[PDB]
Amino acid sequence: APDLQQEAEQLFLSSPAWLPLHGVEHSARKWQRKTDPWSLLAVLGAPVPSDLQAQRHPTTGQILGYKEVLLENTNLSATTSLSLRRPPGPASQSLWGNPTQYPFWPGGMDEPTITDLNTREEAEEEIDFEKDLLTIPPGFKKGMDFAPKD
Amino acid sequence: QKHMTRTIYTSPIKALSNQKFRDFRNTFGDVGLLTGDVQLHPEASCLIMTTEILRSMLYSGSDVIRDLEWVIFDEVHYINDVERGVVWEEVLIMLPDHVSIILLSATVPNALEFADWIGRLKRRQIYVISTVTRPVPLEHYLFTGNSSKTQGELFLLLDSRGAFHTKGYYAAVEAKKERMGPAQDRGVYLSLLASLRTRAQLPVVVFTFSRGRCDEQASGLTSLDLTTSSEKSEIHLFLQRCLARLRGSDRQLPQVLHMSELLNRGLGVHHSGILPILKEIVEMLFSRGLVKVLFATETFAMGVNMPARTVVFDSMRKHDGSTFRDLLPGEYVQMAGRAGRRGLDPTGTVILLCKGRVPEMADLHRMMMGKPSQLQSQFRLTY
Amino acid sequence: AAIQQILGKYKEAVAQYQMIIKKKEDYVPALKGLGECHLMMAKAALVDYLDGKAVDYIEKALEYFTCALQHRADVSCLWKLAGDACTCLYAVAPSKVNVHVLGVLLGQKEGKQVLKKNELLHLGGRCYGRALKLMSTSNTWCDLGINYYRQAQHLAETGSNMNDLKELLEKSLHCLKKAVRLDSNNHLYWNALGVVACYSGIGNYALAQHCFIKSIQSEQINAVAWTNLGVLYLTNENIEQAHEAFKMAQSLDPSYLMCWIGQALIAEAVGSYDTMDLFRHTTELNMHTEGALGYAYWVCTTLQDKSNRETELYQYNILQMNAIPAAQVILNKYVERIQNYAPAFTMLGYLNEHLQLKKEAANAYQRAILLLQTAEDQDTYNVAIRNYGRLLCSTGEYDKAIQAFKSTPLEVLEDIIGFALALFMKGLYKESSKAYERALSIVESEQDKAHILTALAITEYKQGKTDVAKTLLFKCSILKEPTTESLQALCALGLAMQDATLSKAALNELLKHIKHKDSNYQRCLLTSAIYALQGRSVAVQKQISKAVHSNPGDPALWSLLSRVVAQYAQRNAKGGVVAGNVAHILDSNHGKKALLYTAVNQLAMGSSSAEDEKNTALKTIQKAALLSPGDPAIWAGLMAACHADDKLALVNNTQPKRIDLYLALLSAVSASIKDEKFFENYNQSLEKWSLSQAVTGLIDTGRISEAETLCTKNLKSNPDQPAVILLLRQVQCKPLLESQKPLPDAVLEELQKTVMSNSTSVPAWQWLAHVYQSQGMMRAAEMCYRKSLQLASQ
Amino acid sequence: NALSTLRPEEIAALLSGLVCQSPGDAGDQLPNTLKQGIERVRAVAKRIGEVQVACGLNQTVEEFVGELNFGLVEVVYEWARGMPFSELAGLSGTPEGLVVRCIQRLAEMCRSLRGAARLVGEPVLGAKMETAATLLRRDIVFAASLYTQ
Amino acid sequence: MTNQYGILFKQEQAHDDAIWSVAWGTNKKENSETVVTGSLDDLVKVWKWRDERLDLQWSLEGHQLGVVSVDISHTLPIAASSSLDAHIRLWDLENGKQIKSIDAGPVDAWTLAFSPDSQYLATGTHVGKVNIFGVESGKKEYSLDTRGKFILSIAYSPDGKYLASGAIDGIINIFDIATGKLLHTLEGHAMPIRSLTFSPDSQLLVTASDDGYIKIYDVQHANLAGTLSGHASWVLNVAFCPDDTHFVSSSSDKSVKVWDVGTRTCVHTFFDHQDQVWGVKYNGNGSKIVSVGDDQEIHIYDCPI
RNA sequence: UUUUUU
């Protein structure tokens, strides 16, 4: 190792960098804050209503060809539906201890009875988008009054 | 496994679902295990769980319910419990319809008033099967100490045909009258082991009723040495290989050494105040007959089947909840039932050991025989 | 393959699909499956902020979808999935999107084409329209509306236009309204219409509020709609009601990110105390941009406040939650996402500087400089200039730092000081002195004046003129309160001149009234150096032992004691070995020097052990070599240990071992020395000693030729130095005098003169006396030994 | 805010009072901080029992608060520092199976609370329960069962 | 919620001094499971984990000083070792006898790494280069050059075409074997690295520097995906699991942690060693870990699949 | 004075 004297001479008189004058502190910098809550808006996309399912020979079923049909159990989810048709789940997940997920039907209970027979394709109900707009959230006492747009 | 589907075998006891796992993995293929802490292979087709885990993954989906065929409820007579009887009924209610159910039980009287409820809670027919005539029947003796040095006289008070013999009790009461704390009990145990070692009905499981007594009488016994040389070598090699994985300080502390000393002679203790690594070694050295006397307790009486040669009791009343209750017929039947072994003896002997006062045959009647229990329902509300 | 895809596990499904494709190539369902698998991988890639991988995946997915579309172009799902792929690349920071679309998609099937962002979105819209043409369903209508919305958003966000995107927005509203009327019982359509209705270009908040309320009523389990209403209330100064909506929304779904971010924003607005923790939780969930910026801001602001570092706010949060590294990674992701915002870059630079990642801090400041070229406010541009220049100077390339400091108005203390330091580092000492005095002109906070005076002393000393530096430091001492840096610099200057007069006074001044200094090692070093100047050479070790007794901790102190015992008074070798071992035990990062010193001490000792393995000199020096293979002292120690082991084995007379490694170690020593900045005299001593030791080792093993070639090359390299020539003499005269022979007086006189060339070295003289004994002139040998004895005693 | 402001090596010992199922008592050789955290938890339990009994439930406050039986708090506190098992076994008169039991029942609860602190939004409770859990399972208390392997 | 982790075997005193490197090779097509360790000796003991235990098979030695790196091959039966001895003698693993000997000092080789096809055996030098030798075919075909400092770590991506090199002072260099051109140099940490590893499929590069952090970079760009900080001292080795979900890190604080890259958290910690842990590896289908430590011991763990 | 599970 080097002797003490030259070690001290290098340690202190090599350059002024070591001084507290040139440190990372001793600047007192400041920043300005800019929030942007409009970025929080989230829009989710619709699912694909088609599957291109196979065909089957009526006896000893064989694949004639693949034809597209309409799916029927979309808009069904794992946290809002209790049936064995819902999408499997979020991912590989903790086996138990999961709030916000629905159990399947308890076996003595079925609870599916409805027809809702419209079955239209041009089913446009002529909803009014500007006459009387409801402005009370479900559970609150008052909403907000916005000026009308002409 | 033939249908490619999945099956869940559910056991209530945390210690019962380990050897069942071992035997099901040894018998065929893949068997996952789930408990509070173990999660070996949670993708197999014979998942073994505790009912509170099936109750917890029925409230969520858990996507295992999508592939089940059978749910094998093993011991469905725990519904009568006071703090866990609601779990079996929350499970039996939340089960979906495509899952068939198997309910093993223990020959309760009102089996047709319970299966009817489960039959009409679902919309399926339920078949009730009940059997009798267990193999290797059991003879209930009574041992009262006398000539504790070598002589042991046993009075037969119940036989393989259920007939109560008051004559034997008459003899016992007469002898007790004619007759007229730990030092007498030591001679009692040496007289029992003297009359038991003369025959080949050796692998005896003592049932003590308090953990301090449980290891205390095994300490006070202090000379049996029931093991040959090759059994010495196999006991020592197996136990050291299993205990020598873990570190140094963990292998020299009072219970480990003291219990190892007891097992060296061919003696074991199995109460609840020992490390689980010692309970597990006691059972695995008892399941191959290389340990010769076991001072077990009721936990061995519940969590397993494991027939042994000679079961010997020690008292009539155990304190459970501020009661100092005597064994109820339902309880006694299980411990007595695992007395005979299968094809290694004609029958099995259950020895009662009244020492303090008169046996009081009137209550012995209801203890040694009696309708086990009806099937109640302990449903209650939790948060 | 499809079943495996259903459950995630995308890689296995892709592999299976490819195996299928290898056999048959026109199999449409496999092609479609490959496309969805890549699309899902791309979306998962975009959930974490990996924007390059997502682009790769989407390009490949378009490849597969066109491959499928060549065969059956009547099916709708293929067109819709193509449109999904095309439009899922919004907010991916253009100049990162160049997509190699090829073929039928662009009408006619010509070659290949590279599309930018707007073109890609337009192609997506075209694809959705074509899919809708042949199968008119609601979902495609809603997706088409969203695509038009994205195109308008992209045009506005690049400031490319305004009021020329009106038709696009009306088209978007038309499509969403058509979808909603087609099936007015779906929360998705109401929610999408509501979100679009509140876009900055349309600004119809009543319709948006209506749409969100209808969506909530349609299906009550809806965190998205509740959070969108919360945002609507929050931007229009309704803090309470927005708080109600966000709290209930997270009540419905505890792991939705935006509700937590909104809660953090509300807490910040109303000034609570757990806003920083809320931002930390937001960071822990997933990488959103707003939460990222909030957390970075709070971390940097907390670092600024210098009254914190006892609070258990700073202590726990920053130093036990590892806030700084987390903030750095967060900002890296943010900046790659956005990359047109300067304060983000400046915070990134500040944090990187605190992690001593100086090169990345320089890059961050550089990018901030580029951004701020044109702006209304020039002060922030000047501040960025000072910081970028300062970091540039910190790690070489001084010319660039000087140029950066030129291109700024040099009127504030910080900028002038940085300029001064850069100038000094390059050279130009007069310029640095001028800058420091000019900075002294405008000075408050007398601490700063004292520091500038000390810097002046250092810089003018460098030229020479120690007298004026000394007077200037005394002038600094005359100030109200000394700084413990002027006194310390004064002691070092006093030691630099071989006079202990002022050094003692300065040391007494430093010790008397300074306790707030927290090194406790530097003072010991100064005291010991002062004692060593006077040549005392025994007090030194005693003084360091006193210091270690005062503070029995501090591994550094023990290590220094071991080093001094190795250098001065090497007769307490055993104590030195113990001290080095103790220093090594009490930590790990002082391993390097402590192991070196204890190995050298064991070398000095000899073989005073029980012939025990695993604790000889060789083992410890080997351990040190493994810890830090960078310094040349460890390699020299290895040379010495090998030679000593050879001699010990020779004493036991079993076998010489570890024969030929000297050349490799010498090469290592030279290579390691090359990278040391300056200890010039020490480096020269080390290289000279290593060369001599290597030559002697080569002589000992018996590889005379290699030693000869080494010496010849060394002398051919540089002019003669009278030391190595002695080595050449020794290697020459080994064959001769090993067998009895008579020597001519010419060689003997030459050897004597050569020894006289390099005098003041007892080894040489003792070797010459051995030569005299070899031929046999004993009395002459006696005289040579006597001369060596006199030299040693003096 | 009872637990949030303590060291992670004290929250494990404070939570050891819900699981032990052993005869309970207070302590003497306990720090001041533990001796007040015990009172704070008991006071919170008193409030919960008071809202139960003042609502219509039939469970007196004494019956609810009697399930909390501390008395292994100090033993768990000493275990969660690096103390080997032997000294704990010596420490007090409780059978050495019922101690491994309680520790096994606590290291699995300070880990579902590690999972719940991420749900409430307390990443400092998450960062302290993810420390008090990983420092509690090291040795023969958590030895693997023979049957499984 | 974790799996069942635990020890299976504990060799009491493998060598006479510290063990500095370890390599696990399932070289033969059947289940061979040979473990090769080098120590602060000449000893290069070659163990075999046959059914439940390590039985010493070879004790070959030709070295003079302590071994700093050992390596094993998956295709051939072969091994290589380097030491402070300035020699790269590479063994045969079948009769326990030396095959070759390469002269190279600390300016020509520090640490070993075989090729993906076990053919080239690149090493990291002192002056900054990476020297690629040829096994069974001579010496020093070519050397990649990075204008940097002493280079400590050498890693090969499992599929080939990538070579990574850490250095003292932190900087990391990524080359592509196809053309030999520096793709990009990351700056990583600020102090020496001394361990690196790719992931299977070679899209994730895991460093481990001397300050305690574990950067997780991303290949084909310069993105980093997070910093894993859970140790209390130096980090000395990192081994990546055969399935791309976990990796194991051994630190100088006497602790072997197992992380997972999905959530960047530590699943299980092993507290079984008593001194610095210098080497960790996985095996074949990764379900066991070997950990050699400064104290003479060999741990084999159980990480169920 | 016994026993038990998330």
Swiss-Prot record, chain A:
It is found in: Nucleus; Cytoplasm. It comes from the Eukaryota. Transmembrane segments: none annotated. Helicase component of the SKI complex, a multiprotein complex that assists the RNA-degrading exosome during the mRNA decay and quality-control pathways. The SKI complex catalyzes mRNA extraction from 80S ribosomal complexes in the 3'-5' direction and channels mRNA to the cytosolic exosome for degradation. SKI-mediated extraction of mRNA from stalled ribosomes allow binding of the Pelota-HBS1L complex and subsequent ribosome disassembly by ABCE1 for ribosome recycling. In the nucleus, the SKI complex associates with transcriptionally active genes in a manner dependent on PAF1 complex (PAF1C). It is linked to Trichohepatoenteric syndrome 2: A syndrome characterized by intrauterine growth retardation, severe diarrhea in infancy requiring total parenteral nutrition, facial dysmorphism, immunodeficiency, and hair abnormalities, mostly trichorrhexis nodosa. Hepatic involvement contributes to the poor prognosis of affected patients. Component of the SKI complex which consists of SKIC2, SKIC3 and SKIC8. Interacts with HBS1L isoform 2. Belongs to the helicase family. SKI2 subfamily. This is Superkiller complex protein 2. It comes from Homo sapiens. The lineage of its organism: Eukaryota, Metazoa, Chordata, Craniata, Vertebrata. The gene is SKIC2.
From Swiss-Prot, chain C:
Changing P632A: Found in a THES1 patient. One of its GO terms (cellular component) is cytoplasm. The keyword Repeat applies. TPR repeats lie at residues 1-27, 41-75, 152-186, 188-222, 223-256, 342-375, 382-416, 418-446, 688-721, 762-794. Coiled coil: none annotated. It is found in: Cytoplasm; Nucleus. One of its GO terms (biological process) is nuclear-transcribed mRNA catabolic process, 3'-5' exonucleolytic nonsense-mediated decay. Widely expressed with the highest levels observed in vascular tissues, lymph node, pituitary, lung and intestine. Not expressed in the liver. Keywords: Acetylation, Cytoplasm, Nucleus, Repeat, TPR repeat. It comes from the Eukaryota. Component of the SKI complex, a multiprotein complex that assists the RNA-degrading exosome during the mRNA decay and quality-control pathways. The SKI complex catalyzes mRNA extraction from 80S ribosomal complexes in the 3'-5' direction and channels mRNA to the cytosolic exosome for degradation. SKI-mediated extraction of mRNA from stalled ribosomes allow binding of the Pelota-HBS1L complex and subsequent ribosome disassembly by ABCE1 for ribosome recycling. In the nucleus, the SKI complex associates with transcriptionally active genes in a manner dependent on PAF1 complex (PAF1C). Component of the SKI complex which consists of SKIC2, SKIC3 and SKIC8. Interacts with PAF1. It is linked to Trichohepatoenteric syndrome 1: A syndrome characterized by intrauterine growth retardation, severe diarrhea in infancy requiring total parenteral nutrition, facial dysmorphism, immunodeficiency, and hair abnormalities, mostly trichorrhexis nodosa. Hepatic involvement contributes to the poor prognosis of affected patients. Belongs to the SKI3 family. This is Superkiller complex protein 3. It comes from Homo sapiens.
UniProtKB/Swiss-Prot annotation, chain E:
It is found in: Nucleus; Cytoplasm. The gene is SKIC8. Belongs to the SKI8 family. Keywords: Acetylation, Cytoplasm, Nucleus, Repeat, Transcription, Transcription regulation, WD repeat, Wnt signaling pathway. Component of the PAF1 complex, which consists of CDC73, PAF1, LEO1, CTR9, RTF1 and SKIC8. The PAF1 complex interacts with PHF5A. Within the PAF1 complex interacts directly with PHF5A. Component of the SKI complex which consists of SKIC2, SKIC3 and SKIC8. The modification N-acetylmethionine is found at M1. Component of the PAF1 complex (PAF1C) which has multiple functions during transcription by RNA polymerase II and is implicated in regulation of development and maintenance of embryonic stem cell pluripotency. PAF1C associates with RNA polymerase II through interaction with POLR2A CTD non-phosphorylated and 'Ser-2'- and 'Ser-5'-phosphorylated forms and is involved in transcriptional elongation, acting both independently and synergistically with TCEA1 and in cooperation with the DSIF complex and HTATSF1. PAF1C is required for transcription of Hox and Wnt target genes. WD repeats lie at residues 14-57, 62-101, 104-143, 146-187, 188-227, 230-269, 272-305. The modification N-acetylthreonine is found at T2. This is Superkiller complex protein 8. InterPro entries: G-protein_beta_WD-40_rep (IPR020472), SKI8 (IPR051510), WD40/YVTN_repeat-like_dom_sf (IPR015943), WD40_repeat_CS (IPR019775), WD40_repeat_dom_sf (IPR036322), WD40_rpt (IPR001680). GO terms for biological process: negative regulation of myeloid cell differentiation; nuclear-transcribed mRNA catabolic process, 3'-5' exonucleolytic nonsense-mediated decay; rescue of stalled ribosome; transcription elongation by RNA polymerase II; Wnt signaling pathway. It comes from the Eukaryota. Its main location: nucleus.
